[PDB]
Design an enzyme around this catalytic site. Structure first.
Site, mmCIF file in Angstrom:
data_model
loop_
_atom_site.group_PDB
_atom_site.id
_atom_site.type_symbol
_atom_site.label_atom_id
_atom_site.label_comp_id
_atom_site.label_asym_id
_atom_site.label_seq_id
_atom_site.Cartn_x
_atom_site.Cartn_y
_atom_site.Cartn_z
ATOM 1 N N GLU A 55 0.499 2.330 -7.086
ATOM 2 C CA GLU A 55 -0.544 1.304 -7.029
ATOM 3 C C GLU A 55 -1.675 1.704 -7.953
ATOM 4 O OE1 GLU A 55 -0.288 -1.483 -5.266
ATOM 5 O OE2 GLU A 55 1.465 -0.910 -4.058
ATOM 6 N N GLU B 110 4.936 -1.982 5.281
ATOM 7 C CA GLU B 110 4.862 -1.944 3.829
ATOM 8 C C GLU B 110 4.561 -0.521 3.388
ATOM 9 O OE1 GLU B 110 2.153 -4.814 2.056
ATOM 10 O OE2 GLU B 110 1.826 -3.572 0.296
#
Lengths: 230, 230
Positions: A118, A113
């Site tokens: 974020e 990932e």
């Protein structure tokens, strides 16, 4: 060269390139982090050349959008850049990120990932750039918290430069984090395969929450583009 | 609050706030590392609200500008921000930085140095943020190289947040480096005193050079402002 771009200029999301992920995530209920939202096909719009995802609260039901390019637009290596404007407030968790193409045969976290955009609204003025792999996942050690007091203002750029040897992360063209392990087993480095994109906005849960300020809703997460260079 | 700002809006440099440093640097001859330029009073101009310093080569004589606020505008702690546009090319070394007020009684490096904007044209797309102290100077360990591929384009922000406990460095509002030593002796931490500003552009010498591409001249280093918040 620019090999692919999503301009989000259409009247609707192009489903030849995008999937919806929908509902509560069950049997991985709460999408792996005990999250509040149901994902829908009715929480986004194409407006002024942006994808706009809106997080809503209706009664005790929370809703949002999660879309991927799995099996439709996948890339191995490149300079990958998104331009986006954040939602704000305690409990919100917008993300732009990538998952390994082999996820349906090896699962997460073996597939790998890449976390590119974020932000958790409970921690203003901070962004996170991370990797999840078999070697480190969940509370991953391959992560960097970057302070940016202006990040909630306007649009910013979130990017990676991804090669067979290293992963560089950039915010507003500033290199903020580099992952370059000398030992590249698949457990440490599942990144020599194609990956696909995910855009989503979660509410509450193990990472974005658990506390949610319900006064913040509705909140918009706006994405102008994704560009891929190789 | 904003406690002082240099807007560079005058027709001339305000010598109530600025000194010129001139010539070859003696007794610190060659400005300590065989730099080529003589600093003058005729290599700068105030233009369109910017201080513009021009590096020139005339015959085999190189000239530039070096100015300080020593004994005129000095500050202890604060958020200090400059907006500037870089010169470009091999051999050029623009800087915005600070020296400890006690330099004439304790000398360098005991007085301490804070390097806020540092760029060497021989290494494009990179900036440096550093401290020099008695404990670490010259080839200082308290330094960070930050990659920014757009740094030569337009104006950027270079800043520090300086307190009794730590020194944070920011480029375009992104925190790129932090110095926070646990043992704050004067050798390690000369930063609990006022400091003054220096703006200059060196040519060649052992750090910016020694090789100089003479085809680059003239080159402009433009500074829009310095702001100090406390």
């Amino acid at each position: 060269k620019l090999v692919w771009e999503e301009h989000f200029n259409g009247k609707e999301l192009d489903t030849k390139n995008w999937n919806f992920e929908l509902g509560d995530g069950c049997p991985n209920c709460g999408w792996g982090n005990s999250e509040r939202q149901l994902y829908t096909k009715t929480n986004h719009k194409m407006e002024n050349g942006k994808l706009v995802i809106t997080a809503k609260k209706e009664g005790t039901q929370y809703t949002s959008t999660r879309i991927t390019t799995q099996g439709k637009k996948e890339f191995q290596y490149g300079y990958i850049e998104a331009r986006a404007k954040l939602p704000v407030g305690k409990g919100i968790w917008p993300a732009f990120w990538m998952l390994g193409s082999n996820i349906k045969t090896v699962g997460w976290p073996q597939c790998g990932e890449i976390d590119i955009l974020e932000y958790v609204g409970k921690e203003p003025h901070m962004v996170f750039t991370s990797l999840h792999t078999t070697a480190s996942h969940g509370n991953t050690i391959n992560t960097k918290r970057t302070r940016i007091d202006t990040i909630e203002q306007g649009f910013h750029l979130y990017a990676i430069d991804w090669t067979k040897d290293k992963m560089d992360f950039f915010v507003d063209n500033i290199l903020v984090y580099t992952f370059n392990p000398t030992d590249k087993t698949e457990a440490i480095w599942p990144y020599d395969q194609p990956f696909y994109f995910i855009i989503n906005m979660a509410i509450g849960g193990n990472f974005g929450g658990p506390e949610v300020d319900d006064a913040i809703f509705p909140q918009d997460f706006s994405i102008d583009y994704i560009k891929v260079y190789q």
